[PDB]
Ligand binder design. Sequence first.
Ligand SMILES: Cc1cc(=O)oc2cc(OP(=O)(O)O)ccc12
Length: 159
Amino acid sequence: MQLSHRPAETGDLETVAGFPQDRDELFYCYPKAIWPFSVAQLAAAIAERRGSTVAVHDGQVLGFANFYQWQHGDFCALGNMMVAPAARGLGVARYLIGVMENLAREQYKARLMKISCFNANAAGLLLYTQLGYQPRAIAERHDPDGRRVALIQMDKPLE
Ligand SMILES: Cc1cc(=O)oc2cc(OP(=O)(O)O)ccc12
């Protein structure tokens, strides 16, 4: 894996919008989105968020992430973390999370990164734990079927 990163571009939209493979995956990375996902929904998120970034390997966009909260001198909150289906488990999310941690430190002077993860997303909970994130709180949310889910709110000091 030879990964690089750059800001997301218009031309990447269609690729990235192809990443969520089912309603659960879309919900875990973008819970306000409606299935089926679309470029317009992704672009609307990008326009109201900050730091939309892609990860690239062998000429392919393999990952995407941004911030949905940012508070200068304080923290950022990571969201829209998506990985191409052929590139799962290969370190793309770990890579991009490290890039986003640097961006939060450098641009926003953040002392903390927040990641919230829905309870069903075991792979996410385990990854964030490996990367040094700690659970802090659990909040109730509702999924598109009106069923109660638990949002596990995690954080990590930055340096
Ligand atoms: C997990 C997740 C990803 C994302 O991109 O946005 C989120 C936005 C969220 O907003 P509320 O706290 O429900 O207002 C919750 C979770 C996420």
